[PDB]
Structure formats: structure tokens, C-alpha cells
């Protein structure tokens, strides 16, 4: 988490109010944990946040920087995404992440999303495609919002202050997502 996110930037885009639908940007905070001897090893050079740049969505910009992580293909790494939009909202995004998981079987992808975009169409199919490729997808609760504020945000020792309806929004979003991925 070398460079920290602007705090006002964090609250705007990670707000989970269903009645607000901003298409401004999509932020992805990432951390890679190596799972070894009953613990999780985390390196600061494997942490940070991305957004959409050029015509490359944040989920695909993280896949690009995977070789520069110098991961060991003989060990188990768990990658976590804290993402401010529905996972793989862009076209063809779920297919690349699916292919990536098939090649790098030493990687476990865990996706914590501030919200989802239930279109009952292709965005809903993208969420199920990630599940079937092995990804573990769930809605961010107060825990995840507070953790990112402490971990990725330039807070200057200030505590996380939740916005109105954070828990109500999260549980309703959680209920819809669970119904989508239920089997
Ligand atoms: Cl969930």
C-alpha cells in the first residue's frame, strides 16, 4: 500500500447506495497473501489500488501486473479484490479472468464488491462465470469498508466513518448476489 488513496475519492466511489449509479470510475484495491504454515504472508509491494485506465478495465489491469509480482508457481497465493463496482462489468472481462484462473491454478481469487449490477442479463452471467471459474465473490460489509479505509486510504489516523444506510444497502445487495450465485 505504498501510495494511499485520496479519502474523498474512497467515500464517493465505494458508497453502496443502490439509488446512486455513477459510471465515473471503478477502483480495485488488491492484496496477495501467500498461504504457508497456518498463516498468511503479505508483502507491501503486493498491495495497492488500480482504476480504469485507457480502454483497460481495472480487473484486467491487475492481471497485467501479475508477472511483475514474481509469484512462485509452486506455492499457494490468495488474491483479494476490494472493488467499488460490480465485478467484471465490462464486456469480455469475465472471459479473461476465467482463462487466467485456468492457467494459474496456484492462485485463488477472492472478490469483495461494494455493489453488483443485477441486469438479469450479461452482467449477472459474468458474476456466475467468475464463481464457476473458482472465484469467491461476496458483498463488502462494514468490515471490508473499514479495513480498506485503514489499509488503502490516506486517512492520517482518522477512523472510518460510515455513510448513511451502509449496512442496509449491503445486506440487500448481499441477498441479491447470493440468490444469483446460489446452487
Ligand atoms: Cl455476499
Curated annotation (Swiss-Prot):
<comment type="subunit">
    <text>Homodimer. Interacts with APOBEC3G. Does not interact with APOBEC1.</text>
</comment>
<feature type="binding site">
    <location>
        <position position="93"/>
    </location>
    <ligand>
        <name>Zn(2+)</name>
    </ligand>
</feature>
<feature type="domain" description="CMP/dCMP-type deaminase 2">
    <location>
        <begin position="22"/>
        <end position="130"/>
    </location>
</feature>
<feature type="binding site">
    <location>
        <position position="88"/>
    </location>
    <ligand>
        <name>Zn(2+)</name>
    </ligand>
</feature>
<comment type="function">
    <text>DNA deaminase (cytidine deaminase) which acts as an inhibitor of retrovirus replication and retrotransposon mobility via deaminase-dependent and -independent mechanisms. After the penetration of retroviral nucleocapsids into target cells of infection and the initiation of reverse transcription, it can induce the conversion of cytosine to uracil in the minus-sense single-strand viral DNA, leading to G-to-A hypermutations in the subsequent plus-strand viral DNA.</text>
</comment>
<feature type="binding site">
    <location>
        <position position="57"/>
    </location>
    <ligand>
        <name>Zn(2+)</name>
    </ligand>
</feature>
<feature type="active site" description="Proton donor">
    <location>
        <position position="59"/>
    </location>
</feature>
<comment type="similarity">
    <text>Belongs to the cytidine and deoxycytidylate deaminase family.</text>
</comment>
<protein>
    <recommendedName>
        <fullName>DNA dC-&gt;dU-editing enzyme APOBEC-3B</fullName>
    </recommendedName>
</protein>
Amino acid at each position: 500500500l505504498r501510495y494511499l488513496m485520496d479519502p474523498d475519492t474512497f467515500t464517493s466511489n465505494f458508497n453502496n447506495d443502490p439509488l446512486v449509479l455513477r459510471r465515473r470510475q471503478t477502483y480495485l484495491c488488491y492484496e496477495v497473501e501467500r498461504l504457508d504454515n497456518g498463516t498468511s504472508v503479505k508483502m507491501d509491494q503486493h498491495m495497492g489500488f488500480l482504476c480504469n485506465e485507457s480502454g483497460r478495465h481495472a480487473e484486467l489491469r491487475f492481471l497485467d501486473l501479475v508477472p511483475s509480482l514474481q509469484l512462485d508457481p509452486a506455492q499457494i497465493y490468495r488474491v483479494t479484490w476490494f472493488i467499488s463496482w460490480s465485478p467484471c462489468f465490462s464486456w469480455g472481462c469475465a472471459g479473461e479472468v476465467r482463462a487466467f484462473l485456468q492457467e494459474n491454478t496456484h492462485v485463488r481469487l477472492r472478490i469483495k464488491a461494494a455493489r453488483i449490477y443485477d441486469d438479469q442479463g450479461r452482467c449477472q452471467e459474468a458474476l456466475q462465470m467468475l464463481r464457476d471459474a473458482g472465484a469467491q465473490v461476496s458483498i463488502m460489509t462494514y468490515d471490508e469498508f473499514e479495513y480498506c479505509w485503514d489499509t488503502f486510504v490516506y486517512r492520517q489516523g482518522c477512523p472510518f466513518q460510515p455513510w448513511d444506510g451502509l449496512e442496509e444497502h449491503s445486506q440487500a445487495l448481499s441477498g441479491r448476489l447470493r440468490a444469483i450465485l446460489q446452487l
